[PDB]
Design a protein around this ligand. Structure first.
Ligand SMILES: [Mn+2]
Ligand SMILES: [Mn+2]
Length: 269
């Protein structure tokens, strides 16, 4: 079976209990994770160790908190106490865990299920081939010896409009925001980087990225995490919002792909 779980945010206890509920069996089963494995929750260190041990029984995409973790580790960015990253940053195997973490994809595609995963979704301004090229480009810089320069360059909110003629730092920033930060879109598809409210509370003319028809969503299902204020609600057919705010006192949600059945683990916080 194929299982998809949203933002774990260090909620190791709830992750293991959810996986025991469905009797997840490495080897017979595969786990897809929407990223943001770390921060906010108490057990970011245990979650990384466990997800890394899954090997090819796990298909991960990196979220914005994963990237922030890598920026702190490399001394690019300052640690926020609220993130509870210190046990992970101070662990003896932190190098091993974070070098593995930076080599993970931004995008996962399964042609047989016609299923696509990214942390925040697929911008409607991208077709599949553009999405893949963009993920390859940012993954290539993240798995390189020079990744702290990228992590520094990535921070920013412009440009917010895709073009195949975007070059250099601006192309990198947009790619990073589209995969890990996107929520709302203007009618033309351009990213809005500031609103994190629910769709009904958002100011016009903002609509959610998935309410704007795009080439990927028309041929593929898309699963994503990231957008907690959506609460997993209000998406169209074929769009699966899996982040139900576990770290925030919501729930950890698992979707089994074969039968589209949901399993829910309440937050222990
Ligand atoms: Mn996120
Ligand atoms: Mn998140």
């Amino acid at each position: 079976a194929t299982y998809l779980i949203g933002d774990v945010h260090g909620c190791y206890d709830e992750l293991i209990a959810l996986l025991h509920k469905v009797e997840f069996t490495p080897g017979k089963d595969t786990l897809w994770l929407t990223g943001d494995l770390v921060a906010r929750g108490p057990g970011s260190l245990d979650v990384l160790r466990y997800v890394k041990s899954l090997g090819d029984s796990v298909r991960l995409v990196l979220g914005n908190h994963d990237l922030h973790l890598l920026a702190v580790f490399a001394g690019i960015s300052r640690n926020k106490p609220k993130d509870r990253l210190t046990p992970l940053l101070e662990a003896p195997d932190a190098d091993e865990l974070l070098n593995w973490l930076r080599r993970q994809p931004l995008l996962q595609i399964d042609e047989e299920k016609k299923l696509v995963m990214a942390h925040a979704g697929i911008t409607p301004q991208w077709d599949l081939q553009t999405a893949k090229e963009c993920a390859r480009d940012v993954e290539a810089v993240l798995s390189s010896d020079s990744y702290p320069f990228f992590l520094d360059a990535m921070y920013g909110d412009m440009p917010n409009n895709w073009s195949p003629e975007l070059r250099g730092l601006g192309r990198l920033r947009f790619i990073t925001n589209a995969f890990t930060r996107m929520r709302f879109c203007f009618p033309n598809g351009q990213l809005d980087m500031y609103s994190k409210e629910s769709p009904e509370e958002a100011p016009a003319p903002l609509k959610p990225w998935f309410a704007i028809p795009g080439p990927v969503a028309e041929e593929y299902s898309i699963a994503f995490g990231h957008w907690a204020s959506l609460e997993g609600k209000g998406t169209p057919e074929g769009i699966y919002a899996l982040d139900t705010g576990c770290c925030w006192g919501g729930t950890l949600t698992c979707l089994r792909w074969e039968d589209k059945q949901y399993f829910v683990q309440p937050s222990n916080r």
